[PDB]
From a paper:
Cinnarizine is accommodated in the central cavity of PD. The diphenylmethane group occupies a hydrophobic pocket composed of Phe699, Leu702, Leu743, Leu744 and Phe747 in repeat II, and Ile1136, Ile1137, Ala1140 and Met1144 in repeat III. Among these residues, Phe747 on S6II appears to make the primary contribution via π–π stacking with the two phenyl rings of cinnarizine. The cinnamyl group, which points to the SF vestibule, is sandwiched by Met363 and Phe1100, whose carbonyl oxygen groups are constituents of the inner Ca2+-binding site in the SF. Compared to the apo state, the S6 segments in the four repeats undergo structural shifts upon cinnarizine binding. To accommodate cinnarizine, the helical turn of S6III containing Phe1141 undergoes both a π → α secondary structural transition and an outward motion to avoid steric clash. Interestingly, the helical turn where the gating residue Ile1152 is positioned undergoes an α → π transition, which appears to tighten the intracellular gate.
Voltage-gated calcium (Cav) channels regulate a broad range of physiological processes, such as muscle contraction, synaptic signal transduction, and hormone secretion. Here, we present the high-resolution structures of human Cav1.3 complex, comprising the pore-forming α1 and auxiliary α2δ-1 and β3 subunits. Similar to rabbit Cav1.1, the conformation of human Cav1.3 is consistent with an inactivated state, as all voltage-sensing domains (VSDs) are depolarized and the intracellular gate of the PD is closed.
Residue numbers in the entry:
A (entry chain C): 38 to 361
B (entry chain A): 434 to 447
Amino acid sequence: ESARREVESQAQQQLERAKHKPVAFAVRTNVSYCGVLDEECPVQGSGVNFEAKDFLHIKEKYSNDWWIGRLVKEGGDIAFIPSPQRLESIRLKQEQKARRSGNPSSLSDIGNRRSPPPSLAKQKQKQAEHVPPYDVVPSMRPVVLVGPSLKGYEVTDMMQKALFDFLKHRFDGRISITRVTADLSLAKRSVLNNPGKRTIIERSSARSSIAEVQSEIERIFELAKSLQLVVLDADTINHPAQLAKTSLAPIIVFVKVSSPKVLQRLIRSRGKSQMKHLTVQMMAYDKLVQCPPESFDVILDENQLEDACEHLAEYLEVYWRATH
Amino acid sequence: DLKGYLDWITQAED
Protein backbone atom coordinates (compact mmCIF):
# COMPACT_ATOMS: atom_id res chain seq x y z
CA GLU A 1 0.00 0.00 0.00
CA SER A 2 1.27 3.45 -0.97
CA ALA A 3 -1.26 5.42 1.09
CA ARG A 4 0.22 4.21 4.38
CA ARG A 5 3.71 5.13 3.19
CA GLU A 6 2.50 8.50 1.89
CA VAL A 7 0.74 9.37 5.15
CA GLU A 8 3.88 8.18 6.96
CA SER A 9 6.01 10.56 4.88
CA GLN A 10 3.58 13.49 5.06
CA ALA A 11 3.22 13.17 8.84
CA GLN A 12 6.98 12.69 9.24
CA GLN A 13 7.75 15.74 7.07
CA GLN A 14 5.50 17.88 9.28
CA LEU A 15 7.39 16.68 12.38
CA GLU A 16 10.64 18.61 11.90
CA ARG A 17 8.73 21.71 10.77
CA ALA A 18 7.26 22.07 14.28
CA LYS A 19 10.52 21.09 16.01
CA HIS A 20 11.42 24.74 16.64
CA LYS A 21 7.95 26.10 17.44
CA PRO A 22 6.55 27.37 20.76
CA VAL A 23 4.77 24.93 23.07
CA ALA A 24 0.98 25.17 22.89
CA PHE A 25 -0.26 23.54 26.11
CA ALA A 26 0.35 20.60 28.45
CA VAL A 27 -1.56 17.95 30.41
CA ARG A 28 -0.74 15.09 32.78
CA THR A 29 -1.04 11.32 32.34
CA ASN A 30 -1.92 9.14 35.34
CA VAL A 31 -1.98 5.81 33.47
CA SER A 32 0.75 3.53 32.10
CA TYR A 33 0.74 3.08 28.32
CA CYS A 34 3.19 2.84 25.42
CA GLY A 35 2.74 4.70 22.15
CA VAL A 36 5.06 2.44 20.15
CA LEU A 37 3.28 -0.91 20.61
CA ASP A 38 0.04 0.53 19.20
CA GLU A 39 -0.42 -0.17 15.49
CA GLU A 40 -2.64 2.89 14.91
CA CYS A 41 0.17 5.42 15.39
CA PRO A 42 0.88 7.40 12.19
CA VAL A 43 4.63 6.81 12.68
CA GLN A 44 5.78 3.41 13.95
CA GLY A 45 8.92 3.20 16.06
CA SER A 46 8.82 6.83 17.25
CA GLY A 47 6.34 6.28 20.07
CA VAL A 48 6.56 7.48 23.66
CA ASN A 49 7.41 5.11 26.53
CA PHE A 50 5.74 7.07 29.32
CA GLU A 51 4.63 5.85 32.74
CA ALA A 52 2.21 6.89 35.48
CA LYS A 53 2.41 10.52 36.64
CA ASP A 54 4.39 11.88 33.69
CA PHE A 55 4.41 15.14 31.75
CA LEU A 56 4.14 16.06 28.07
CA HIS A 57 4.15 19.26 26.02
CA ILE A 58 1.73 19.55 23.10
CA LYS A 59 2.72 21.99 20.35
CA GLU A 60 0.35 21.45 17.40
CA LYS A 61 -2.83 19.59 16.44
CA TYR A 62 -3.00 16.47 14.28
CA SER A 63 -6.40 14.76 14.69
CA ASN A 64 -8.99 13.69 17.27
CA ASP A 65 -7.13 10.40 17.89
CA TRP A 66 -3.46 11.48 18.03
CA TRP A 67 -1.47 14.46 19.29
CA ILE A 68 2.11 15.67 18.90
CA GLY A 69 3.91 16.03 22.21
CA ARG A 70 7.39 16.38 23.66
CA LEU A 71 8.48 14.63 26.85
CA VAL A 72 9.42 16.77 29.84
CA LYS A 73 12.57 14.65 30.26
CA GLU A 74 15.91 15.96 29.05
CA GLY A 75 16.61 15.05 25.44
CA GLY A 76 12.92 14.57 24.67
CA ASP A 77 12.30 13.75 21.02
CA ILE A 78 9.20 14.01 18.84
CA ALA A 79 6.56 11.54 19.99
CA PHE A 80 2.84 10.82 19.61
CA ILE A 81 0.58 10.57 22.67
CA PRO A 82 -2.94 9.10 22.33
CA SER A 83 -5.91 11.45 22.47
CA PRO A 84 -8.40 11.32 25.37
CA GLN A 85 -10.82 9.47 23.09
CA ARG A 86 -8.05 7.25 21.72
CA LEU A 87 -6.93 6.34 25.24
CA GLU A 88 -10.55 5.46 26.04
CA SER A 89 -10.64 3.15 23.00
CA ILE A 90 -7.51 1.35 24.20
CA ARG A 91 -8.81 1.49 27.78
CA LEU A 92 -11.70 -0.75 26.74
CA LYS A 93 -9.22 -2.87 24.77
CA GLN A 94 -7.18 -3.76 27.87
CA GLU A 95 -10.05 -5.37 29.82
CA GLN A 96 -11.80 -6.95 26.82
CA LYS A 97 -9.11 -9.60 26.24
CA ALA A 98 -10.26 -11.38 29.40
CA ARG A 99 -12.81 -14.19 29.31
CA ARG A 100 -15.61 -11.93 30.60
CA SER A 101 -16.00 -8.28 31.56
CA GLY A 102 -19.60 -7.85 32.80
CA ASN A 103 -21.72 -9.84 35.23
CA PRO A 104 -21.84 -13.36 33.65
CA SER A 105 -19.10 -15.42 35.26
CA SER A 106 -17.59 -18.33 33.32
CA LEU A 107 -17.54 -20.58 36.41
CA SER A 108 -18.43 -23.70 34.39
CA ASP A 109 -21.56 -21.96 33.04
CA ILE A 110 -21.56 -21.87 29.23
CA GLY A 111 -24.60 -22.26 26.98
CA ASN A 112 -27.27 -21.42 29.58
CA ARG A 113 -27.02 -17.69 30.44
CA ARG A 114 -25.98 -15.70 27.37
CA SER A 115 -26.40 -12.44 29.33
CA PRO A 116 -26.27 -9.84 26.53
CA PRO A 117 -24.13 -6.84 27.49
CA PRO A 118 -26.23 -4.36 29.48
CA SER A 119 -25.60 -0.64 29.99
CA LEU A 120 -23.65 -1.37 33.20
CA ALA A 121 -21.05 -3.36 31.22
CA LYS A 122 -19.84 -0.34 29.20
CA GLN A 123 -17.89 2.83 29.98
CA LYS A 124 -20.99 5.06 29.97
CA GLN A 125 -21.87 3.75 33.45
CA LYS A 126 -19.81 4.04 36.67
CA GLN A 127 -20.30 7.82 36.58
CA ALA A 128 -19.95 8.11 40.37
CA GLU A 129 -16.46 9.65 40.07
CA HIS A 130 -15.36 9.56 36.40
CA VAL A 131 -11.76 10.63 36.96
CA PRO A 132 -10.43 12.10 33.69
CA PRO A 133 -7.36 10.24 32.40
CA TYR A 134 -5.83 13.54 31.24
CA ASP A 135 -5.77 16.53 33.59
CA VAL A 136 -4.96 20.08 32.51
CA VAL A 137 -1.83 20.78 34.56
CA PRO A 138 0.53 23.76 34.06
CA SER A 139 3.28 23.29 31.50
CA MET A 140 5.92 24.12 34.13
CA ARG A 141 5.42 22.94 37.70
CA PRO A 142 5.48 25.83 40.20
CA VAL A 143 7.99 25.58 43.04
CA VAL A 144 6.71 25.97 46.61
CA LEU A 145 8.66 25.89 49.87
CA VAL A 146 6.90 24.19 52.79
CA GLY A 147 7.88 23.78 56.43
CA PRO A 148 9.24 23.62 58.93
CA SER A 149 6.44 25.28 60.92
CA LEU A 150 3.36 27.47 60.53
CA LYS A 151 3.42 29.84 57.56
CA GLY A 152 2.95 33.57 57.99
CA TYR A 153 4.90 33.66 61.26
CA GLU A 154 8.45 34.80 61.94
CA VAL A 155 9.95 31.31 61.78
CA THR A 156 8.76 30.17 58.34
CA ASP A 157 8.70 33.48 56.43
CA MET A 158 12.38 34.39 56.92
CA MET A 159 13.93 30.92 56.44
CA GLN A 160 12.13 30.79 53.06
CA LYS A 161 12.71 34.45 52.16
CA ALA A 162 16.46 33.89 51.92
CA LEU A 163 16.02 31.12 49.35
CA PHE A 164 13.73 33.37 47.30
CA ASP A 165 16.42 36.05 47.14
CA PHE A 166 19.16 33.48 46.52
CA LEU A 167 17.25 31.99 43.58
CA LYS A 168 16.21 35.43 42.32
CA HIS A 169 19.80 36.69 42.11
CA ARG A 170 21.00 33.69 40.09
CA PHE A 171 17.84 33.53 37.93
CA ASP A 172 17.55 37.29 37.43
CA GLY A 173 16.13 38.25 34.05
CA ARG A 174 14.50 34.85 33.54
CA ILE A 175 12.38 34.19 36.66
CA SER A 176 9.22 35.72 38.13
CA ILE A 177 8.45 35.74 41.86
CA THR A 178 4.82 36.21 42.91
CA ARG A 179 3.05 36.05 46.27
CA VAL A 180 -0.62 35.05 46.46
CA THR A 181 -2.86 36.21 49.30
CA ALA A 182 -6.03 34.33 48.32
CA ASP A 183 -6.50 30.71 49.31
CA LEU A 184 -5.16 28.22 46.77
CA SER A 185 -5.76 24.83 48.45
CA LEU A 186 -9.40 24.92 47.25
CA ALA A 187 -8.47 24.50 43.56
CA LYS A 188 -11.21 22.08 42.56
CA ARG A 189 -12.57 21.28 39.11
CA SER A 190 -15.42 18.77 39.55
CA VAL A 191 -17.55 20.46 42.22
CA LEU A 192 -20.10 22.19 39.97
CA ASN A 193 -20.45 23.38 36.39
CA ASN A 194 -20.00 27.01 37.46
CA PRO A 195 -19.98 27.71 41.22
CA GLY A 196 -20.73 31.40 41.65
CA LYS A 197 -20.81 32.51 38.02
CA ARG A 198 -21.88 36.06 38.91
CA THR A 199 -21.08 38.29 41.89
CA ILE A 200 -24.58 39.82 42.08
CA ILE A 201 -26.43 36.56 42.81
CA GLU A 202 -26.08 37.16 46.58
CA ARG A 203 -26.06 33.39 47.13
CA SER A 204 -24.10 31.41 49.73
CA SER A 205 -20.95 31.20 47.58
CA ALA A 206 -21.47 34.53 45.79
CA ARG A 207 -20.50 36.66 48.81
CA SER A 208 -17.77 34.27 50.04
CA SER A 209 -14.11 34.07 48.97
CA ILE A 210 -14.65 30.96 46.83
CA ALA A 211 -15.06 33.12 43.72
CA GLU A 212 -11.62 34.69 44.24
CA VAL A 213 -10.07 31.21 44.43
CA GLN A 214 -10.73 30.23 40.80
CA SER A 215 -9.65 33.60 39.37
CA GLU A 216 -6.08 32.98 40.56
CA ILE A 217 -6.01 29.48 39.03
CA GLU A 218 -6.43 30.68 35.44
CA ARG A 219 -3.76 33.31 36.10
CA ILE A 220 -1.45 30.48 37.21
CA PHE A 221 -2.36 28.69 33.97
CA GLU A 222 -1.62 31.80 31.90
CA LEU A 223 1.58 32.48 33.85
CA ALA A 224 2.62 28.88 33.14
CA LYS A 225 2.35 29.44 29.38
CA SER A 226 4.78 32.38 29.66
CA LEU A 227 7.66 29.81 29.67
CA GLN A 228 9.37 31.72 32.51
CA LEU A 229 10.08 30.01 35.82
CA VAL A 230 7.58 30.95 38.54
CA VAL A 231 7.60 30.17 42.27
CA LEU A 232 4.72 30.58 44.71
CA ASP A 233 4.93 32.17 48.16
CA ALA A 234 1.50 30.94 49.28
CA ASP A 235 0.93 31.09 53.04
CA THR A 236 -2.12 28.80 52.84
CA ILE A 237 -0.09 25.60 52.30
CA ASN A 238 1.00 23.45 55.24
CA HIS A 239 0.57 19.79 54.14
CA PRO A 240 1.58 18.35 50.74
CA ALA A 241 -1.58 16.22 50.47
CA GLN A 242 -3.75 19.34 50.79
CA LEU A 243 -2.38 20.68 47.48
CA ALA A 244 -1.75 17.29 45.82
CA LYS A 245 -5.13 16.36 44.33
CA THR A 246 -5.49 19.76 42.65
CA SER A 247 -4.63 20.25 38.98
CA LEU A 248 -1.67 22.57 39.67
CA ALA A 249 0.16 20.16 42.03
CA PRO A 250 3.12 22.48 42.74
CA ILE A 251 6.65 21.28 43.41
CA ILE A 252 6.70 20.50 47.14
CA VAL A 253 10.14 21.39 48.54
CA PHE A 254 10.65 20.16 52.10
CA VAL A 255 12.94 21.71 54.71
CA LYS A 256 13.50 19.41 57.68
CA VAL A 257 15.35 19.56 60.99
CA SER A 258 17.49 16.75 62.40
CA SER A 259 15.96 16.86 65.89
CA PRO A 260 13.25 18.83 67.71
CA LYS A 261 15.94 19.93 70.18
CA VAL A 262 17.31 22.22 67.46
CA LEU A 263 13.83 23.66 66.90
CA GLN A 264 13.16 24.29 70.60
CA ARG A 265 16.38 26.28 71.03
CA LEU A 266 15.70 28.15 67.77
CA ILE A 267 12.66 30.04 69.10
CA ARG A 268 14.55 30.55 72.38
CA SER A 269 17.04 32.63 70.38
CA ARG A 270 14.19 34.63 68.81
CA GLY A 271 12.47 36.06 71.86
CA LYS A 272 9.36 36.09 74.02
CA SER A 273 7.05 36.69 71.04
CA GLN A 274 7.17 33.20 69.50
CA MET A 275 7.11 31.18 72.73
CA LYS A 276 3.33 31.65 73.02
CA HIS A 277 2.81 30.04 69.60
CA LEU A 278 5.73 27.64 70.13
CA THR A 279 3.23 24.97 71.22
CA VAL A 280 1.62 24.89 67.77
CA GLN A 281 4.95 25.21 65.93
CA MET A 282 6.14 21.97 67.54
CA MET A 283 2.92 20.28 66.41
CA ALA A 284 3.29 21.60 62.85
CA TYR A 285 6.75 20.06 62.45
CA ASP A 286 5.54 16.78 63.95
CA LYS A 287 2.44 16.50 61.76
CA LEU A 288 4.55 17.31 58.69
CA VAL A 289 7.52 15.04 59.43
CA GLN A 290 5.23 12.01 59.91
CA CYS A 291 4.20 12.33 56.26
CA PRO A 292 6.19 9.85 54.12
CA PRO A 293 9.16 11.48 52.35
CA GLU A 294 8.35 10.08 48.90
CA SER A 295 5.28 12.31 48.58
CA PHE A 296 7.51 15.38 48.73
CA ASP A 297 9.20 16.29 45.45
CA VAL A 298 12.61 17.11 46.97
CA ILE A 299 14.25 17.21 50.40
CA LEU A 300 16.65 19.72 51.98
CA ASP A 301 18.49 18.02 54.85
CA GLU A 302 21.61 20.21 54.69
CA ASN A 303 22.12 22.77 57.45
CA GLN A 304 24.65 25.14 55.86
CA LEU A 305 23.71 28.19 53.81
CA GLU A 306 25.60 27.20 50.66
CA ASP A 307 25.04 23.44 50.43
CA ALA A 308 21.31 24.04 50.93
CA CYS A 309 21.20 26.62 48.13
CA GLU A 310 23.16 25.00 45.29
CA HIS A 311 21.54 21.62 45.99
CA LEU A 312 18.24 22.98 44.67
CA ALA A 313 20.05 25.04 42.01
CA GLU A 314 21.01 22.11 39.77
CA TYR A 315 17.62 20.45 40.34
CA LEU A 316 15.85 23.48 38.87
CA GLU A 317 18.52 23.98 36.20
CA VAL A 318 18.25 20.39 34.95
CA TYR A 319 14.46 20.80 34.86
CA TRP A 320 14.88 24.08 32.97
CA ARG A 321 17.04 22.43 30.30
CA ALA A 322 14.83 19.32 30.20
CA THR A 323 11.72 21.30 29.19
CA HIS A 324 13.45 22.80 26.14
CA ASP B 1 23.89 21.82 63.74
CA LEU B 2 23.10 25.01 65.68
CA LYS B 3 26.22 26.61 64.17
CA GLY B 4 24.76 26.52 60.66
CA TYR B 5 21.15 26.80 61.85
CA LEU B 6 21.49 29.98 63.92
CA ASP B 7 23.53 31.67 61.17
CA TRP B 8 20.77 30.98 58.63
CA ILE B 9 18.09 32.26 61.02
CA THR B 10 19.72 35.70 61.46
CA GLN B 11 21.04 37.03 58.15
CA ALA B 12 17.82 36.18 56.28
CA GLU B 13 15.67 38.95 57.80
CA ASP B 14 17.79 40.98 60.24
